[PDB]
C-alpha cells in the first residue's frame with residue numbers, strides 16, 4: 001500500500017524558515033526518487049527539485065536554488081525540504097511526489113500537499129458588513145472581512161435559513177482573509193421578516209450577528 | 216526556460232473520445248521529454264496517469280493513453296467517464312528541469328449545462344466609514360465550472376484591484392465563485408457605474424450597479 005504523508009498546514013512568520021516533511025511507506029524508499037512541487041491555488045504547478053534518497057543527490061530548479069533545501073533521512077523513510085527567508089509570497093501548497101526513475105518514468109504517487117501560510121498577522125476577528133441589494137427570489141449576503149486565522153463559521157438566522165446558502169472560499173489579502181456568504185429568500189420574507197448572518201471566528205472567540213437592513 | 220502549453224478547458228460527454236495536447240515552446244516534444252500526465256481531482260488529490268510519454272501508471276484505467284501527435288505529447292481518454300472530470304497537467308523534461316503546463320480543466324457532462332446566477336452588491340454603508348468600499352460579485356450554480364469575470368468601472372475594463380475565487384464544487388455538482396472589487400471610500404464616490412461581467416460557456420451575464 002503506497003503512501004506519502006505530509007502534514008496538512010504550517011503557519012510561519014515572514015523571515016523564518018520551515019522544514020516540511022514527506023514520510024514514505026509501502027515501498028523501498030531508495031528505489032524511487034522523490035520530488036517537491038509548488039502550487040499557488042489557481043496558477044499552476046512549479047517543480048522545486050528532486051532528491052535521490054539513496055545517495056542524497058539533488059537537482060534543483062534554478063529558480064529555487066537559494067530558497068529550497070532537499071534532504072532525506074533513510075532510517076525513517078522521510079524526505080524533507082527546508083524553505084528559507086520566507087515571505088508572504090511563499091504561501092502555497094507544497095506536494096511531494098515519487099518518481100519512478102529506474103522504471104517507467106512517472107510521478108505515480110503524490111502527497112496530499114502541505115499548505116504553508118506565511119503571515120505576520122495576529123489573531124484578528126472579522127468585521128462583518130451587511131450585503132443588501134439595490135433595485136421572484138432575493139439574494140442577500142454578508143462580507144466577513146479581514147480576519148485571521150482561518151476559519152470563520154457563517155450561519156443565517158442561527159440556522160433556520162439553511163437552504164440556498166452559499167459560503168465562498170476565502171482570499172488572503174495583505175496577511176488577512178476575506179469571505180462572503182449569501183442566502184436567497186422569498187421576496188415576501190424580505191424585508192418584512194429580518195435576516196441576520198451569524199459570523200463566528202473561533203481563534204478570537206468572536207460572535208457577530210448582523211441584521212441585513214434594506215438600503 | 217521552456218514553456219508548456221495546454222488547452223484551458225474542454226468539455227465532452229460520457230462515452231466520448233477526447234484528446235488533451237501539450238506543446239513545448241522550443242520545438243517538438245520528443246521521447247526525450249518523458250512527457251508525464253497528472254490528474255488533480257478536488258481536495259488537492261494528485262494521481263500520475265502517464266509517465267515516459269506512454270507508460271500507463273498502475274491502476275490507471277485503460278481508457279487513458281499517452282502518445283505524440285506531431286510535435287506535441289497527447290493524452291487521449293477513450294470513452295470518457297464522469298469520474299474523469301478534473302484538471303490534467305502535463306510535464307516535460309528539459310535535460311535537467313521539469314516544466315508543467317497550465318492545466319486543462321476537463322468537464323465530462325454528468326448533467327445539463329447551467330447558467331450562472333450573478334449578484335453584485337455595492338459597498339455597504341458601514342464600510343465607506345472605513346474609507347474603504349468593496350464591491351461583491353457572487354456567482355453560483357454554473358456548469359461547466361469555468362467562468363470569466365470582468366469588472367467595468369465607468370465603462371473601462373478594470374485591470375486592478377479585482378480578486379476572483381477559484382470555482383468550488385457545490386453539493387449539487389455545480390460551481391460557485393466570487394469576485395471582489397476593492398476601492399477606496401474615495402474612488403467609489405469619484406465614479407458612476409460598476410459592472411460585473413461573467414462569461415460562461417459562450418453567454419455573458421452583466422450585473423450593473425448604478426451608484
Ligand SMILES: O=C(O)Cc1ccc(O)c([N+](=O)[O-])c1
Nearest residue numbers: 050059099100101105249308
Ligand atoms: O526519468 C528520466 O529519465 C528523466 C530524468 C532524468 C534525470 C533526472 O535527474 C530526472 N529527475 O526527475 O530528476 C529525470
